[PDB]
Structure 1
Amino acid sequence: GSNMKAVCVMTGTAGVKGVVKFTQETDNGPVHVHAEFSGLKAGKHGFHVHEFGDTTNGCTSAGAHFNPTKQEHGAPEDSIRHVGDLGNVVAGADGNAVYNATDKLISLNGSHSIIGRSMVIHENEDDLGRGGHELSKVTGNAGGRLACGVVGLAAE
């Protein structure tokens, strides 16, 4: 039937790791996203679903932000955004981060399904397409890919 839970274990070679959990109680309902990370520089870090669930080559094969609606990069709350745009994960002074959001664009089913794709957490802050740079409207100018993982179906 409809997928109601998913998970993503994120790793890399930068000392950053984390786990993302997703719930979707109805086939077209909002998805609850919960993430925990460690090893991050204090502050904001870009967090998005990328197109491919290919983590080989140190996250460099994950592709661009997941964008089935062919839009420019934006903030999760914006009408204009990539389906994969989940904004920023905020790390405290200790390098740990807790993230929670309810999103209506990503899904665990249908065309916006993130199952089998990648979650990526970035080196720098996602400017939400508001930075004024060319990269702002593509990547949010979030810099390098610190950790990634493929999104898998979870028990429900």
Structure 2
Amino acid sequence: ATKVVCVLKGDGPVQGIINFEQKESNGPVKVWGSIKGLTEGLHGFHVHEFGDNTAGCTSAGPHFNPLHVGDLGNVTADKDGVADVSIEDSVISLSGDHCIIGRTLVVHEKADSRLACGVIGIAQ
């Protein structure tokens, strides 16, 4: 897989679609998309260990950090509550030890609770 996608949903208004692409094995991963329903300002953005939505975002487990690897920084919401995301990350991967396929992406209430999340799935 060179492309994966995540649909973020939660108990409140936060929702979005985030794409990840890694055209070269072990290469940088491009992350992009949009999230709406957020309070204006900065929000933590993290891959968590488990792609387990049995208890909503509360079952996603800890930040992904194999022996954080899953820490993607903050996303920024504007006055309309929309965060446009465009990130490059060379620590996460779509293969190998830092593989994020089948894990959970979470957008958090605070800047670095879990507002929305989804399982990271194969898109291509």
TM-score norm. by structure 2 comes to 0.97
User: Which stretches of structure 1, 4 residues or longer, exceed 3 Å deviation after superposition?
Assistant: none
1:120 to 80, 96, 106: 106
* Number of the residue aligned with 1:96: 82
Does residue 1:22 correspond to 2:20, yes or no?
Answer: yes
The alignment yields a C-alpha RMSD, in angstroms, of: 0.7
Q: Which amino acid aligns with 1:105?
A: V
Secondary structure of 2:23 counterpart = coil
Deviation, 1:116, is 0.1
* Number of the residue aligned with 2:117: 148
- % identical aligned pairs: 58
* Number of the residue aligned with 1:43: 41
Deviation, 1:56, is 2.1
Provide the C-alpha distance between the structure 2 equivalents of 1:35 and 1:49, rounded to a whole number of angstroms: 15
Secondary structure of 1:18 counterpart = strand
Deviation, 1:51, is 0.0
Q: Which amino acid aligns with 1:57?
A: A
* Structure 1 residues 67-88: Cα deviation after superposition (integer angstroms, max 9, x where no partner): 013xxxxxxxxxxxx1100011
Task: List alignment gaps of at least 5 residues for structure 2.
Answer: none
Greater per-residue strand proportion: 2
Secondary structure of 2:39 counterpart = coil
Deviation, 1:14, is 1.2
Provide the C-alpha distance between the structure 1 equivalents of 2:21 and 2:119, rounded to a whole number of angstroms: 16
Larger Rg: 1
Aligned length: 124
Provide the C-alpha distance between the structure 1 equivalents of 2:53 and 2:116, rounded to a whole number of angstroms: 9
Provide the C-alpha distance between the structure 1 equivalents of 2:33 and 2:53, rounded to a whole number of angstroms: 19
1:34 to 23, 32, 35: 32
Secondary structure of 1:33 counterpart = strand
Provide the C-alpha distance between the structure 1 equivalents of 2:18 and 2:53, rounded to a whole number of angstroms: 16
TM-score norm. by structure 1 comes to 0.78
Provide the C-alpha distance between the structure 1 equivalents of 2:100 and 2:80, rounded to a whole number of angstroms: 30
